[PDB]
Design a protein around this ligand. Sequence first.
Ligand SMILES: *[C@@H]1O[C@H](CO)[C@@H](O[C@@H]2O[C@H](CO)[C@@H](O[C@@H]3O[C@H](CO[C@H]4O[C@H](CO)[C@@H](O)[C@H](O)[C@@H]4O)[C@@H](O)[C@H](O[C@H]4O[C@H](CO)[C@@H](O)[C@H](O)[C@@H]4O[C@H]4O[C@H](CO)[C@@H](O)[C@H](O)[C@@H]4O)[C@@H]3O)[C@H](O)[C@H]2NC(C)=O)[C@H](O)[C@H]1NC(C)=O
Lengths: 108, 125, 125, 125, 104, 104, 104, 135, 151, 151, 151, 191, 191, 191
Amino acid sequence: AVLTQPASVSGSPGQSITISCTAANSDIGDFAFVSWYQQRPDKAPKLMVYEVSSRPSGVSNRFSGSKSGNTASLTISGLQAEDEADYYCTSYTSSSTFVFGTGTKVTV
Amino acid sequence: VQLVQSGAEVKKPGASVKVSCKASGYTFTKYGISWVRQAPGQGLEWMGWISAFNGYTRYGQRFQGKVTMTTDTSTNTASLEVRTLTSNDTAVYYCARQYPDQYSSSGWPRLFAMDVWGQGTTVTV
Amino acid sequence: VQLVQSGAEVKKPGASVKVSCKASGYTFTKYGISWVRQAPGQGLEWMGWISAFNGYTRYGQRFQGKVTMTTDTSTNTASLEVRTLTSNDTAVYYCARQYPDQYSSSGWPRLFAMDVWGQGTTVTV
Amino acid sequence: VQLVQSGAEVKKPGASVKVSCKASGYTFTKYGISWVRQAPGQGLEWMGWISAFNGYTRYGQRFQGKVTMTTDTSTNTASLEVRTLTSNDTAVYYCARQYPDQYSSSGWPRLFAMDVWGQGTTVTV
Amino acid sequence: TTLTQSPATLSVSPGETATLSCRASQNVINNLAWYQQKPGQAPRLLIYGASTRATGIPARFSGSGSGTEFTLTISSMQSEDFAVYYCQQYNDWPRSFGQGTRLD
Amino acid sequence: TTLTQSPATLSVSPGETATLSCRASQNVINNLAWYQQKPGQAPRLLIYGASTRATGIPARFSGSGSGTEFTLTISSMQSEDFAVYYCQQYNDWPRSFGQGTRLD
Amino acid sequence: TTLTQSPATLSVSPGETATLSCRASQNVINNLAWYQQKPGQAPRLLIYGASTRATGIPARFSGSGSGTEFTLTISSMQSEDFAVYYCQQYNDWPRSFGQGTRLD
Amino acid sequence: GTLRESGPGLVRPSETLSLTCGVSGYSISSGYYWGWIRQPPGKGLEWIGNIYRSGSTYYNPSLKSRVTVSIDTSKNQFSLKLNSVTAADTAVYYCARSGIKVADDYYYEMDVWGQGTDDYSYAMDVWGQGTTVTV
Amino acid sequence: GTFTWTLSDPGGYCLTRWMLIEAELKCFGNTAVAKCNEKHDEEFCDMLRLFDFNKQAIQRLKAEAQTSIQLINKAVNALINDQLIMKNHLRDIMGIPYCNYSKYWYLNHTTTGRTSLPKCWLVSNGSYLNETHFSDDIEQQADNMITEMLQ
Amino acid sequence: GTFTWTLSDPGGYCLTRWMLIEAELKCFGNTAVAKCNEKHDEEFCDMLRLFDFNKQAIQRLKAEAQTSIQLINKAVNALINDQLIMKNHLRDIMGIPYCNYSKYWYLNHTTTGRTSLPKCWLVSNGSYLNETHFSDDIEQQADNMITEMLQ
Amino acid sequence: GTFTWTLSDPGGYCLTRWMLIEAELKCFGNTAVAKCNEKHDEEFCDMLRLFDFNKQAIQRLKAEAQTSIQLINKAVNALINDQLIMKNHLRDIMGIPYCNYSKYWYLNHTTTGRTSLPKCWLVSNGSYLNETHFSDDIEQQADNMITEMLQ
Amino acid sequence: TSLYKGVYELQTLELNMETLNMTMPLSCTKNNSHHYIMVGNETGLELTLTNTSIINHKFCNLSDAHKKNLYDHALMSIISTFHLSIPNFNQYEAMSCDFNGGKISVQYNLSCGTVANGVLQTFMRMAWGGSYIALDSGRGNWDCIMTSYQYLIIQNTTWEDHCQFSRPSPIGYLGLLSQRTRDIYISRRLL
Amino acid sequence: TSLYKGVYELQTLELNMETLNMTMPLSCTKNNSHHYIMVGNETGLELTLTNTSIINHKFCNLSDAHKKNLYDHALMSIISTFHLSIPNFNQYEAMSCDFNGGKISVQYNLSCGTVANGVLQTFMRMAWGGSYIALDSGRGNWDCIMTSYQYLIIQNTTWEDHCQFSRPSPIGYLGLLSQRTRDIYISRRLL
Amino acid sequence: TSLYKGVYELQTLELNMETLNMTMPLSCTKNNSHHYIMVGNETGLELTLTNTSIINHKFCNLSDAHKKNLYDHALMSIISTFHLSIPNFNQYEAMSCDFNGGKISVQYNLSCGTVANGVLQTFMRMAWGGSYIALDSGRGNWDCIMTSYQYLIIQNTTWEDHCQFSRPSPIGYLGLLSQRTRDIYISRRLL
Ligand SMILES: *[C@@H]1O[C@H](CO)[C@@H](O[C@@H]2O[C@H](CO)[C@@H](O[C@@H]3O[C@H](CO[C@H]4O[C@H](CO)[C@@H](O)[C@H](O)[C@@H]4O)[C@@H](O)[C@H](O[C@H]4O[C@H](CO)[C@@H](O)[C@H](O)[C@@H]4O[C@H]4O[C@H](CO)[C@@H](O)[C@H](O)[C@@H]4O)[C@@H]3O)[C@H](O)[C@H]2NC(C)=O)[C@H](O)[C@H]1NC(C)=O
């Protein structure tokens, strides 16, 4: 299985941007409970969104998540210069395994 | 089968009035007697119901204590006694016949209405 | 108690054969009649069963439309009619008494065989 | 209804003692017979019970083999036999009348005591 | 319970049907009664139950309805049918009466 | 099962009541029998069941109790009442008697 | 259902027993029938049910079996018993007949 | 609490790699599933496997043949062992804790451990610092 | 346990035109309804109790929400016999004509007007049995009610 | 699942003073008791079986230490009919005077001393109904008693 | 609930040689079997229903290598009364002779050949009771047969 | 006293339920708020309708309570029969429990078609006689029982003469016994 | 119009089950694959023997659905009765669920003495009248019910005059109530 | 002979329950320690009372056993019926299990409100008719029953003639069917 994301996403400071994580239609059933992680350069990944629009603690309400059919969307509203990091989508398959997405390099 | 009441009677307000209705043409102990009041020009108003079998009484809420209700199986007589009379108690009183409501363990309640009415007895103060 | 099946018939192919048997010695209405055909040399083969109580018919799979059965309570007779003849319809036809299969809510099915037969009627084309 | 036992028997130890009680005044078959022994000056001791219907026998745990109980419906008698007499067996024997204990599927057990006794029979060594 | 009669009057010429309505405060399962009272006369039982006709009553009077809503219909009204009609529930104590309706 | 009578001797004067007690090893539900034995005579059934008196027995004797404890009361003692009284259980086999009590 | 008769020929001398077999396609609980047809005559019912004998049938004919396999036995063979034998199921419609066996 | 990495940096190819992550503050026996994540230099994250306090493991099918994950509740740590290390395995390894729910382990741990908090995020809640493995 | 619901109301039971399809009101006498109080194996009696319970519940209890199932779940065993429909299910399994509770038949006297207790019309392979295949049962019912009329 | 407990003991049943409130021992004859072995809808029979079971359990089984409920949990359905109390619960819900299991009434012949099977006194508004409101039931019981006495 | 199985087949029931231990065909008349359709406390009737259900299931339904008990789990309540075996268990607890459904006794008319409904042979202390300890029950069954003979 | 047909006299009897204490639980009612179900002459359960809560946490330990076999088995059986009989119970947060030291304490938060409806129906079936006092005219549907009280508290108590409004009776418990697990939702695939 | 004994005329009546709609669920079959069970005149459940799936994961929330109280309680009660009535169910992976927004969707994989046999037996007992058409010829040893379809889907639906093959009837649901938890395996020592 | 009323003769018959093997489980007893429950002519369960344990771990892999659908479904059904019928079972560690490779091994620690009493009561009910020889002729309470043995072991076995002390009979199993879930405790708020 594989989850496809855009190679890179760009946006001006202050606006809202979206990141899409898409799975093949034959892979439905292995695309469940999608969650979004952020990894800054040379630093371990940090969980930012889990399930849908749920945030662990402290992270600002800018990060929102949505899921529709075979697609997931992570929206960052109010972009700043510190949001330049690699964003990953992961899914919990019905075979009790984690599948990691390709990853998007957000640029401001 | 009809019921015969006492008759017209007038007295000064503050006294007590006894009204008698006699039943004939049927077994008196089978059916109870209900009492109805109608003010001149107003609608009928319920007073109470007495069982002729043993004397069990259901009284109207606004007539408890003020009105007493008695039965006599020897002479087939039902009597209504009013102790205090006021200006608004002038009316016509009716003695209706009513079978008791019946309940059973294996069965469903059978409720009854007022079959026959005696001629009214007028009371004026 | 026997059943007598008309008489022998021979006729040109393509026409209709009308064979009959009159049942005597028992209450005709109680039992139905089943028709069995035996071709020369081969074994018995079922045609259909008709009830004499009301005329309910259970046809064979391959004899539907091709053949018909009727009853007549007044004459106490059962009758079989074959519409189209062909060289393979030459045979001997038997009518056999058979009680209707009985079902009940408080009980188990009671199915019956062909009790008494009648001498066959030969049909040649 | 009374029961009569045998006479007073005395014999040398080592022999066998036979004592019989003959019933009268009731259906001998319907009631069983129980046997009780009383040593001189001591309390009553139970030995066994034999039904007069089929001869079913319930013996005392310490009287098996040494004591034999039989019934005879023709002469209406219940007999007891002691095999090996000993000084500790010198006593008085009583024949008592006891109804069989009754059990049923739809019911509860009905148990019985010794209704009518018989005059004792003395045995000395 | 309290029950009210909607028309409270009916100026109707003789010959045609007349319809009278009764509405109870609470549920009264087919335990209604309709009486008529002519002026200077004691009321008499017309209909007991929802739709049962008392003995000696002409078939012009017919009852219908249940639950809360009940109706009484007179098919071919006449001169003797001009009276005051009263509605009673006997489902529970105390018994209640309608305010009455006038047929003129 | 075994059963013992506690007093075993009542040197009581005539004319007064007497009480005898019986206790069993196991549970004997209302299945006791009191017998009376005169000197030199066969025992006779006095009480059967819990408290039912045998036919022909005077009403002076009375029985009571159940389970493991039973009592026999003689109200107006007479000259003939002086005998040996025995307690028997018939709830289960084998049948067993008490050691007896002497009444004088 | 379809049912077949395996032997199809039982050339045998008079006196000794003869055994005939029937096998059904599906289950036919004791709902079989054995018919005998002498040449030039209409078939007659020998055995109805699995093993019940029709009225007027000699005791030398016996039936047995249930389910799928059934058997018919003739003990004391005679000269009039050299006829054709047919097996019928009446458990369901349409009725079915065996191909027949000629006992010669 | 935190998760700390340990293990040799350089590995001779065609040998066995051994890493160990020790936890502080958090208790392994408390719950959660403890697993390993791998990131090749410049590439995307890849999941290796998870282990549970009951001992059951769940591996990546593309790596199931040559990996194993071990647990130790006494010393409160969990370890990774890689068989037949190839030069393609040079990467960064993280130890992470996930609050996933598996039906098998749930239906097993009922009589002894009662019922869980019913608060499952199905996500890697906390991560280790991560250590570099160069072949 | 066993059912305890008693049919309401001289002494018979009348099915209104609402309980029947393409039919008018039908009344059954006391002698037929009285069998419904002691027989444990009558489908018509059980359905008649179900209809009576529905009518009484509608008449007396209120109905405002999106209906409810608790009332029937709580009182199902006081109205019907579950082993009856279990028996029908078993007869269905064994390939025997059974009862699906839709249609019933009865014998009604031409002159007297008396009626027997209806028995349900058996169904086999998706279609109703025809009277020629249970005429013996009808004749038995006629015998039974002749005997009943004799007393 | 029909009950199976049969009452202990000529052929009647006697309620002792412990089973009755402010009363002496009472006894009911064979005819009244024999109805308890067939009828499925009598409350007095159910309670009478409960009392008999309690008496027998106290006598036969030994009792000590904590009280245990397992015995009545096992054998509840062999004594009473749960659908009877379910029917009373439904009648209470519908507003009808229902039957709590405290008081019972019966008819008792003045001369012969014959007694009918007691029936439970109904309660409405948390007070017992008066005889004037179920006198028809009493008259029906008297008719049944006379009919039974005839044969 | 209540059992609804009706015995198969004039109107009697015959237990074959396979249904009995060291015995041959035993047939019981219509009048004895008719009691099995209305009584609630007969062990022989429940055993007859179990045997009949087994026979019909073997005849009509197919079978395979392994045995499945789903059918008997489903259809048990339509054949037997569980409160009867509960009653026997209770009588066992209280130290009273009980029925373990193995042996039965009945009465045979020497000349006519009519019999009664067999009743269970009670077992106490692991041994069957002697006839002397249930002679009264036998006499009562004889009296009942006389009574129904004079009718 | 009245003579029916001049031959028959109507007589009454009243059953004493306070003699089956040794075999079955007995339920009765003291007043609007307090009802009791007693076992033996020693222990029982008190059911009270109140506005004031006695448990503030949201824990219901039951595996832990079963592990420490300290409670009375009869009372645990009774509360199991009560809880299982609640129709359509689906809000586990509405029930709190406390079993420290072998005691039993259960609290149902009643603050239709809701959890309060089901709990009140079970409660009125349990203490069948005299429970109608607290009806509070909640009838709005088929049953749709409502009350003004906020909490139902079930605790254990020592036996005492504790019911003045209705006599003790075993009917309520014996009725809840049959309808025991008939209305429960599925909470997991493998049960 | 034949007369039996010349005195009696055979007459028939057929009951209108549909008038029981607002007290009981009414189940009936439309055609070979579509069967319905309606509650009231508003909602109901659609049981389809479909042969292409609609749920692709292996999860089945039931605790979260109960906590987020949004479904219809009657329909949840119905599906609880159905699932609990399945005899000898042990392959939990065979059943998938979906409840978001208050909807009800369950799906059984069905692909003897297997899980498909038990699910089919329960399905035949539920929609009793008119379910034999979907049974095919696969029925075998004892029951051993087999079907050619590869999925069983239960969704909710709005009321509509659907069933034209079999009349509405409450018998199947009223029958599954008795056999509701009589055949379930133990999955843990302490239930 | 014995003719009652001079005309009737007492006659007996004995039932051969062994011919019900195709449809029902049959319970049997050989001696004090060994009892059996046979299904079909092939398999069955063996119930033994011993001082010697065969399982030394505190495990019961029931969910994993269901996942590996290797056991015989009839035997699993029988042991589920047995375990569910234990009244007031709360000590989960008193029961150990082993289901390796399709086996069915269950062990009960029997060493009054004790687990031994409940397990013994269910055992007497299941193997009813010949189990009383393990009763030890002692009743401490209403139905407290105690035995010297401290392990009850239920294994599988192949069919063999084992009925030396009692005849095969389905009554015990058909008895536990009704009393199957009637006496269990609640272990979770939301079952
Ligand atoms: C079925 O349905 C019926 C009808 O609703 C229902 O009947 C009612 O039962 C209750 C419960 O018994 C009855 O209430 C009793 O009433 C008596 C008498 O009432 C008056 O009593 C005195 C005058 O003597 C007045 O002060 C009082 O205000 C009443 O007017 C009371 O005496 C009862 O209380 C005593 O008994 C209780 C329990 O034993 C004690 O807790 C209480 O303290 C009282 O005991 C006192 O006397 C004892 C001696 O008897 C003594 O030992 C104590 O120490 C103490 O001094 C009780 O309140 C009610 O009247 C019945 N009738 C009605 C119309 O309500 C059934 O209960 C119901 N059955 C079931 C199973 O549900």
